[PDB]
Design a protein around this ligand. Structure first.
Ligand SMILES: [Mg+2]
Length: 906
RNA sequence: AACCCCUACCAACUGGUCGGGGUUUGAAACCAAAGACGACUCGUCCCACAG
């Protein structure tokens, strides 16, 4: 009933406190239910709350914009089942004891929602931190993992790390530890001398004058130690605590050092000073037109900037926030001016008719017309009609008629910004634009939900408070505001302008080349050195500028270089099967000139009559035939007076399409691998939770025994022992006989007709009763269902713990994204990125565990070898560690339920 | 869309039917914010320019 305005809570003490739409400085608690009560805390009759059917439902109704639109009746009642609504994992008590400690004696269900939001934060952070760690390990080029567990962390400063001999007291006088620190310092010294640091120029380089100069080693060591500490914190589930605890990200203010704090403050101050200089200088690009279109004085309309474009916030006299705005779909009609003029229209209803004159009467304006439009748009029922409200709103804002043609310190410094937000910004310094947007949006939404729940808790009678270890979440509103601010400018410049010979060789490699390394070095030197060894004069750098503007300065190429190898990606792009699938997938978006037609016109020519399939085939032929020798022989493209301009633009478009295809492939692979990364993170988290719960599970041997330990624990009684098999069978047979004898007391009395005792429904239901008795011993609401319990017990008897451990270890290291180049050309047919990723993973596991495996797993390996496609049974056997959660097990093992965006195809 | 919980009718109940609910299940409640998703034209990669 979200469309009618129902965001009600369920359990709070012994009453049902039905909440409503928050974030409006009003309507925090609408209805309160105790027994058969219908009393309302607030006034106004937002929605009806009469008890439907008087047994297990509350009939909700509304007056306008929230009609059921047909035969429908809304009903819900939490207290009908008796006790509080237990979580399906059966760990809400442990979660409340961990995060809240002495909660409201378990008689609440908003604390568990806050804890689930925290867990979602942890999942998304672990995913993106693993991605950033893999990117740093790939760009570093070293075989040794410099970010994973075992390397340096935020415990030692740069002075102690550089000179471990004079700081022997800090390392507990351990000679092995001192030797390890010396080895790590040697690796760090080799890391600074790596010319590939320009890829992470936002974190390891500083902009000053005209070139980029590497900052001091202090900041670089601080950033690397912060990344390593994040990597240690996201893996703090197998080990309880050795040096970095689980609350490290929350106690950073007490765990980090002044050096790391100063590094984060320096980064934040640098980016904020750049933003301030930009807002002071480049304002004339828009204020010159705004002064004529909805503008009186240059100091008046400029106040909206630095808060609208650089902050994406409102912070007006009302209570609406970034999540309570209207996208407006760019008015569905240049773009920069029209977006600001329309934003300036409905913003006056929050300052001109605000509480300065509206607080005296009930409402001066039409009850906050912005919030009223939000409520009218809140009718999520039949969302295919929400776009009609934008059309009606566009016909209402026509009174503007202004779209004819179309200084002080605003942002905080590094001191009044949380270390959490500064570390999130430093982490986004290692991610792409899409990844940054997704991560920051998820974090903003989760923190906003957390702060809303924390504001609702005291009014519904919940006095739960966070422990000292998790008291960081008390500032969730400030955290969300800082994250919104950071997201507003976290995508301003990925690469640097100081590209080197290494980057030139990488650009030549990704464009296709078979020359030796010495020949590549010579060709890269020819970009800046003449035929006599001197640097080229000004104006003779045409080829180098072209390569820069086409390859190195491309965000897609940056994403490709962070997660992949240029030669490997070039070998990937030579396969016509996958390229035709990617190009064919772009042609399917035309249902929403065409993109394929534009690509064919800009890359191949203005030929007509060619069908879509022929255009895709031609684009595949010109993309698979990509080679740098095409641009080398035509190096005369440096002339840009107008003759070779057509060929230059054609080459630009071809390179753009090539990089776009490879970027799509790699991004899909990474997004699919991140799902199983999050899955194994959840497996480890729930393992630790069930260990803290009081059950029998070995967190030390969950690696050797396979990650299916949680699945075996939640399945119930373990029957994986030959001596215990007969005992368990006899006990379950006795239980089934007792249940059959005791069933004859109710509507299942009809069992007296389905009995023949030879092989009929009698013995059939006897076996099914044995199965459900085995199922009732489960420890969670998922595996308590007899169907899923039987499926899990069948999957457990044929499990391969070594194969599961290998799959878990390879899912975190992105070995699929590493070895895709070696197994992409061994596929019979590519149907989707899901099947591609899983075939590559199974091929890697086979290459590692073919001669060592046996039993049914060898049959699945042989089937994969013969059929040249992924095996669904082998996949669902690898998802057994996910067996404790049935939705996750079904989403990560079934292709039709994996992707939510591709659900329309299935 | 998978899963879970519901009043009415059947149904070992590991089946279903009209409908509702789930931020307390899965990337995963409303509005927004991302993503699938590549573009179009006007402050982001236009070269009047930049090693
Ligand atoms: Mg959730």
């Amino acid at each position: 009933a979200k469309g009618m305005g129902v965001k009600s809570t369920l359990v709070s003490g012994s009453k049902v406190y039905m909440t409503t739409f928050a974030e409006g400085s009003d309507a925090r608690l609408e209805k309160i239910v105790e027994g058969d009560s219908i009393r309302s805390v607030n006034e106004g009759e937002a929605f009806s709350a009469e008890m439907a059917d008087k047994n297990a439902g509350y009939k909700i109704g509304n007056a306008k914009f929230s009609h059921p639109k047909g035969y429908a009746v809304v009903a819900n009642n939490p207290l009908y089942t008796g006790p509080v609504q237990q979580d399906m994992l059966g760990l809400k008590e442990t979660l409340e004891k961990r995060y809240f400690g002495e909660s409201a004696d378990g008689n609440d269900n908003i604390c568990i929602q806050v804890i689930h939001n925290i867990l979602d934060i942890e999942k998304i952070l672990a995913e993106y931190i693993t991605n950033a760690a893999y990117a740093v390990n790939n760009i570093s080029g070293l075989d040794k993992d410099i970010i994973g567990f075992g390397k340096f962390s935020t415990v030692y400063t740069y002075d102690e790390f550089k000179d471990p001999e004079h700081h022997r007291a800090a390392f507990n006088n351990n000679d092995k530890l001192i030797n390890a620190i010396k080895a790590q310092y040697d690796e760090f010294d080799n890391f600074l001398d790596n010319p590939r640091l320009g890829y992470f120029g936002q974190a390891f380089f500083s902009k000053e004058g005209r070139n980029y100069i590497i900052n001091y080693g202090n900041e670089c060591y601080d950033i690397l130690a912060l990344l390593s500490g994040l990597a240690h914190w996201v893996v703090a589930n197998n080990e309880e605590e050795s040096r970095i605890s689980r609350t490290w990200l929350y106690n950073l203010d007490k765990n980090l050092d002044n050096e790391y704090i100063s590094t984060l403050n320096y980064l934040y101050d640098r980016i904020t000073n750049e933003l301030t200089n930009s807002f002071s200088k480049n304002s004339a690009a828009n204020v010159n037109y705004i002064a004529e279109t909805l503008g009186i004085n240059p100091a008046e309309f400029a106040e909206q900037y630095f808060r609208f474009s650089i902050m994406k916030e409102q912070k007006n006299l009302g209570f609406n926030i970034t999540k309570l705005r209207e996208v407006m779909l760019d008015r569905k009609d240049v773009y920069t001016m029209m977006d600001f003029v329309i934003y300036r229209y409905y913003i006056e209803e929050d300052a001109k008719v605000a509480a300065a004159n509206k607080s005296l009467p009930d409402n001066e304006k039409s009850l906050s017309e912005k919030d009223i439009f939000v409520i009218n748009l809140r009718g999520s029922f039949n969302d295919d009609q929400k776009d009609a409200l934008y059309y009606d709103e566009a016909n209402r804002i026509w009174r503007k008629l202004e779209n004819i043609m179309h200084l002080p310190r605003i942002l905080p410094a590094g001191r009044d910004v949380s270390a959490f937000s500064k570390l999130m910004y430093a982490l986004t310094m290692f991610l792409d634009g899409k990844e940054i947007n997704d991560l920051l949006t998820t974090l903003i939404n989760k923190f906003d939900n957390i702060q809303s729940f924390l504001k609702v808790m005291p009014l519904i009678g919940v006095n739960a408070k966070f422990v000292e270890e998790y008291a960081f979440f008390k500032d969730s509103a400030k955290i969300a505001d800082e994250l919104r601010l950071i997201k507003s400018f976290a995508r301003m410049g990925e690469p640097i302008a100081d590209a080197r010979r290494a980057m030139y060789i990488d650009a030549i490699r990704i464009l296709g080349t078979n020359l030796s390394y010495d020949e590549l070095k010579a060709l890269a030197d020819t970009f800046s050195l003449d035929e006599n060894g001197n640097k080229l004069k000004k104006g003779k750098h045409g080829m180098r500028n072209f390569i820069i503007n086409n390859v190195i300065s491309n965000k897609r190429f940056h994403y490709l270089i962070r997660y992949g190898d240029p030669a490997h990606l070039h070998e990937i792009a030579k396969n016509e099967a996958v390229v035709k699938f990617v190009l064919g997938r772009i042609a399917d978006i035309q249902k929403k000139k065409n993109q394929i037609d534009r690509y064919y016109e800009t890359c191949i020519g203005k030929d007509k009559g060619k069908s879509v399939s022929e255009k895709v085939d031609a684009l595949t032929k010109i993309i698979t035939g990509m080679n740098y020798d095409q641009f080398d022989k035509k190096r005369s493209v440096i002339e840009d007076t107008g003759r070779e301009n057509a060929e230059r633009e054609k080459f630009k478009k071809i390179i753009s399409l090539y990089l776009t295809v490879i970027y799509h492939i790699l991004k899909n692979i990474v997004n699919i691998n991140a799902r199983y990364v999050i899955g194994f993170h959840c497996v480890e988290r729930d393992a630790q939770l069930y260990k803290e719960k009081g059950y029998d599970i070995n967190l030390k041997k969950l690696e050797e025994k396979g990650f299916s330990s949680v699945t075996k624990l939640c399945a119930g009684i373990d029957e994986t022992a030959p001596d215990k098999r007969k005992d368990v069978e006899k006990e379950m047979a006795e239980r089934a006989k007792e249940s059959i004898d005791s069933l004859e007391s109710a509507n299942p009395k009809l069992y007296a007709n389905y009995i023949k005792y030879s092989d009929e429904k009698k013995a059939e239901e006897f076996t099914r009763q044995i199965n459900r008795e085995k199922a009732k011993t489960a420890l969670n609401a998922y595996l308590r269902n007899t169907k899923w319990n039987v499926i899990i017990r069948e999957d457990l008897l044929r499990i391969d713990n070594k194969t599961c451990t290998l799959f878990a270890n390879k899912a975190v290291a992105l070995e699929v994204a590493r070895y895709v180049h070696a197994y992409i050309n061994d596929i019979a047919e590519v149907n989707s990125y899901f099947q591609l990723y899983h075939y590559i993973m199974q091929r890697i596991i086979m290459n590692e565990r073919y001669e060592k495996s046996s039993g049914k797993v060898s049959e699945y390996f042989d089937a994969v070898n013969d059929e040249k496609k992924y095996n669904d049974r082998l996949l669902k056997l690898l998802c057994v560690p996910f067996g404790y959660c049935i939705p996750r097990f079904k989403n990560l093992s079934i292709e039709a339920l994996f992707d939510r965006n591709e659900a329309a195809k299935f």
